[PDB]
């Protein structure tokens, strides 16, 4: 990347970091600047004569590279940079710490014909790798790797028990179970970070979809009470005490 | 030409996912071309279980279209289909091409909902009805085009 004719881009990508970071935090204003900045550079990488000479992966391999480096340096400025968000991370974690100890497939409507041995342990560990990456792309992959893992074992169960391939009647509930069991810390923040800073043009199709899934997984898990997981208002609360005591 | 977002709505046992399988997972792309205009279809599956009803709007946010499936052999899902279109009529952007599909007609005498019952309600509310079937490939290829024809 550090070719003796790249200096133009560096002086720009460096100068945006300073200009940008030296702004007081605003989630709307900030990310509109970043998604705004990415275009400026998008055209730029492709226009730049010294780069003749490229396919389409190569145009993205560049954009990913810019999404990454830039977001790395700007991470602690964009990620959970306000208080109301940090609280939502705390609130969720508490909820998920407790409910994981006693939730079962039925609560969320997962039929036995789709129940898994491991509790889809492999899916859980993919989400749990989320804070091991700083690039919006990489973070997203953690999520998509969770989704795929889920589908394979789900698809398997359909073959195993002769049914059709699985739809949202199967995926959404298992995603939740698996999110609760997983407790991927700083979720609320995480899902927004990716939402605000994944090169907008890539947050689309197959990806946008399963992202809306996990976003609605957060929502649901946030709102959990007896009724949303189908339990007596007695059982549910008692379980909460137990879980609290453990 | 036109990227387009479609949403399936309806309960379990409406079999919307058994339905779209003939149209070739929870999500399906399909670039479809009609009358020199070309439409890419982004089709989005939803969880049909009541306990998720209020997640629905996170999915149909920015929907170009929606298909509402019900079960013809089990009456109560037709009513759930009513509440759906009712909810769409109100919460989606008013420029939305909706379609009603009555699935599982693949049973030659079990059907509990009449063709008029369905045709009349659909007519009344600005959409068409189709008698969908997954076992006999009926009205799957078909239903997407009529919607395509109708997109801004």
UniProtKB/Swiss-Prot annotation, chain A:
It comes from the Eukaryota. The chain holds residues 17 to 262 of 520 of the full protein. Widely expressed. GTP binds at residues 164, 169. Functions as a guanine nucleotide exchange factor (GEF) for Rab small GTPases. Activates specifically RABF1, RABF2A and RABF2B proteins. Required for early stages of embryogenesis, cytokinesis, embryogenesis, and organ development. Is essential for the establishment or maintenance of the polar localization of the auxin efflux carrier PIN1. Residues 86-230 form the VPS9 domain. Homodimer. The homodimer interacts with RABF2B. Interacts with RABF1 and RABF2A. Disruption phenotype: Embryonic lethality when homozygous. Embryogenesis arrested at the torpedo stage. This is Vacuolar protein sorting-associated protein 9A. Changing residue 209 to A: Loss of interaction with RABF2B. Decreases GEF activity 25-fold.
From Swiss-Prot, chain B:
Changing residue 47 to G: Loss of interaction with VPS9A. Its main location: membrane. Keywords: Cell membrane, Cytoplasm, Endosome, GTP-binding, Lipoprotein, Membrane, Nucleotide-binding, Prenylation, Protein transport, Transport. GTP binds at residues 10-18, 45-49, 103-106, 133-134. Expressed in roots and actively dividing cells. Transmembrane segments: none annotated. Coiled coil: none annotated. The keyword Electron transport does not apply. It is a lipid-anchor. This is Ras-related protein RABF2b. It comes from Arabidopsis thaliana (Mouse-ear cress). The chain holds residues 8 to 172 of 200 of the full protein.
